[PDB]
Design a protein around this ligand. Structure first.
Ligand SMILES: O=C(O)c1ccc(-c2nn(C(=O)c3c(Cl)cccc3C(F)(F)F)c3c(Cl)cccc23)c(OCc2ccccc2)c1
Lengths: 261, 261
């Protein structure tokens, strides 16, 4: 493609990413740096006041560590719908075979959730409830049994990912590249998927050169992070399996379990 | 950032050392696999008896063990060749000694799988410096856990080989793998990443010049570094099962130290 068309595609994706995701990285950073303060959850008593005052919707029908864990599952289900609507704006995506559309979303949403979660994280905690709350890393890491070790890998990835200093216009193309992965299992027609991904990679490459001209081989370094994502997603799955087979206090209402499947 | 002419100089340096360090290149393997040559034809091992005849021609334990022990023997040789190659990568021997060890520990296996693909097609793999060829089917029919040992290698190779890299491409790709700054336990990540930036620039220009019609081959090749990380993980878990089941079987010290942690 011609440079001018790559810029058009980049601009198209940025506008749609703004409409699909309510809390952007730009806004989240304004909150985290200190540049209406968020309510801070740093221990058991401040958690209690937070749901009493802000009323986090990932709450009400239990042990605290379980309630927090399920809260992360609730938000993840919300995010899937936001990612799904974004994918529809990627040129060519809705023209793919319907089963392949479903397959790309199924295997891609986990990598995108971790990616975008880094936008809401710093080394000390994570924004919640569209940025109205902030949950400290320490409070999370101090949850009992396997739950303490659940959130820490996310922070460790986020600290390293954020060192790249990407902005929302970079991330919108990066997220698109992840969705159009031609190596997802069960794809019926790989060729148009890889054809779209080639366009997106060209647009990401030019975007990074123009937006970060002093950041040598940022393109390559960002592609290398797709290894960190694939690796952390697999660990996540293994962590769930261990919770499912050991924690008898996890059962929800059957309808809820279905929503959260 | 480097000038184009210096990047070409580095590509030629690395290709030259790759030829000096690895006796069986992809170019040689392909000439043997393609055929049409009476002087380079391999003896083919496809079952028990042809294996028995093979030892008389190419030149008391169970078959699956003898084959398995054969692969670890060749792996130790490959580690040796890979170590000699790394010493030629500009800047590598100037790094902190512990980091030199660390880069090799985590990198040798990803490189072994990469170069093993050169010796592979969908039906089998060259052995004994290309004098032999062992079919995929024969490997997959080996008993116990050994049958499933090589098939993941074959599955990766078929996709990696579709990229159609030649030895001059692979020489830079292998160098990029070795100089990974995200290896666990590295003491000085920054000097490793400066070297890799140079290597990534050299790979980018090499791929553009040697494959001008292969759009985004650079990006596609980097995404393959993801398939490598996952295949190493499977391998390590397969070994562990064998260590705890075949208590009379032993690894080479070099291999033992690599897999520790
Ligand atoms: O607003 C967002 O964009 C947002 C996106 C992701 C999470 C979040 N997901 N998450 C997972 O575990 C996870 C992941 Cl990464 C990928 C796939 C699936 C899951 C699943 F289902 F297991 F939940 C997290 C962990 Cl472990 C620690 C911190 C955050 C997360 C998020 O949390 C906000 C939050 C809400 C309530 C209480 C505390 C924090 C917000």
């Amino acid at each position: 493609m011609e440079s001018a068309d790559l810029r058009a595609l980049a601009k198209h994706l940025y506008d749609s990413y703004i409409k699909s995701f309510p809390l952007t990285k730009a806004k989240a950073r304004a909150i985290l740096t200190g540049k209406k303060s968020p309510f801070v959850i740093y221990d058991m008593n401040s958690l209690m006041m937070g749901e009493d005052k802000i009323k986090f919707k990932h709450i009400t029908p239990k042990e605290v560590a379980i309630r927090i864990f399920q809260g992360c599952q609730f938000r993840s289900v919300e995010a899937v719908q936001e990612i799904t609507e974004y994918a529809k704006s990627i040129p060519g995506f809705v023209n793919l075979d319907l089963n392949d559309q479903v397959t790309l979303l199924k295997y891609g949403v986990h990598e995108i959730i971790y990616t975008m979660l880094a936008s809401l994280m710093n080394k000390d905690g994570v924004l919640i409830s569209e940025g109205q709350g902030f949950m400290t890393r320490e409070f999370l890491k101090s949850l009992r049994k396997p739950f303490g070790d659940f959130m820490e890998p996310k922070f460790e990835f986020a600290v390293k990912f954020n060192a790249l200093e990407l902005d929302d216009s970079d991330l919108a193309i990066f997220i698109a590249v992840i969705i159009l992965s031609g190596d997802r299992p069960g794809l019926l027609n790989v060729k148009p998927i890889e054809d779209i991904q080639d366009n997106l990679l060209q647009a990401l490459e030019l975007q990074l050169k123009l937006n970060h001209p002093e950041s040598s081989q940022l393109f390559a370094k960002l592609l290398q992070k797709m290894t960190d994502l694939r690796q952390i997603v697999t660990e996540h799955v293994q962590l769930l399996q261990v919770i499912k087979k050991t924690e008898t206090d996890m059962s929800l209402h059957p309808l809820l379990q279905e929503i959260y499947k």
